[PDB]
C-alpha cells in the first residue's frame, strides 16, 4: 500500500471493516491457489469481531472436517505465537 | 517471481514441494496478520497430497473448532468454484 502498516488492531472501525473484507478475499484466493498448485485440501474458518462466521473449503467443508476427525494429531501445528517468533527471528539474521 | 505461473498442478515433484512449503507459510503469515489487524479468530487446515495434516489457529485450534460446531450455518461459504468465478469475471 501507499504506506507500510504495523501489525496491530486497526483503530478506525470503517478501515478495519474494509481491510477485513479485502484481506479475507486475498487469503481465500491464496488458499485456492495453494490447493490447485500443490494438490492439497484446504479449509479456512474465520470469526470476525462480531462472531459472524466466514468460511472457505477448497473442496467441501463437510468433507474436509470429516477427514480432520480421522486424525489423532497434526504433522504440523502453528499458532500466532509461532509465526510471530519465526518473524522476529528472521528480523535479526 | 521471475515469471508468472498459471494456476494448475505443478508437474515437477521437487518444485511442487518447495512451492508448498513457502506458500503454506505465506498463507499462515497472512492469516496471522488478518487476525491481529481486524481482531478475528482464524483456523486453517491443510492436507497435502500425501494426506499429511498441517494446521494453524490464531488462538487455539480446539477453541476455534469447538465454536464452529455451535453454528447451524455460516454467514459466508466459499469454495474454489466461487473464487474462480469471481476471478474470471472482473
Amino acid at each position: 500500500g501507499r504506506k507500510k502498516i504495523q501489525i496491530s488492531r486497526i483503530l478506525d472501525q470503517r478501515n478495519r471493516q474494509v481491510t477485513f473484507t479485502k484481506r479475507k478475499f486475498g487469503l481465500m484466493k491464496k488458499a485456492y491457489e495453494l490447493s490447485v498448485l500443490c494438490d492439497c485440501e484446504i479449509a479456512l474458518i474465520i470469526f470476525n469481531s462480531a462472531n459472524r462466521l466466514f468460511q472457505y473449503a477448497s473442496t467441501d467443508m463437510d468433507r474436509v472436517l470429516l477427514k480432520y476427525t480421522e486424525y489423532s494429531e497434526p504433522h504440523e501445528s502453528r499458532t500466532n505465537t509461532d509465526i510471530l517468533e519465526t518473524l522476529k527471528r528472521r528480523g535479526i539474521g | 517471481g521471475r515469471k508468472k505461473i498459471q494456476i494448475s498442478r505443478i508437474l515437477d515433484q521437487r518444485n511442487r514441494q518447495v512451492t508448498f512449503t513457502k506458500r503454506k507459510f505465506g498463507l499462515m503469515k497472512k492469516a496471522y496478520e488478518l487476525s491481529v489487524l481486524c481482531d478475528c479468530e482464524i483456523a486453517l487446515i491443510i492436507f497435502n497430497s500425501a494426506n499429511r495434516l498441517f494446521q494453524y489457529a490464531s488462538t487455539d485450534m480446539d477453541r476455534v473448532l469447538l465454536k464452529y460446531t455451535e453454528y447451524s450455518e455460516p454467514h459466508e461459504s466459499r469454495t474454489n468454484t466461487d473464487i474462480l468465478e469471481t476471478l474470471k469475471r472482473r
Partner: peptide, 26 residues
C-alpha cells in the same frame, strides 16, 4: 453442503473428537 453447513453426524464427531481429547485439534 448447500449453504456450506456440515451434517450433524460430522459436527458431532468433530465435537466428540475434540472434547474426548481424541482430535488433532487438542
Amino acid at each position: 453442503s448447500p449453504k456450506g453447513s456440515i451434517s450433524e453426524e460430522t459436527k458431532q464427531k468433530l465435537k466428540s473428537a475434540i472434547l474426548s481429547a481424541q482430535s488433532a485439534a487438542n
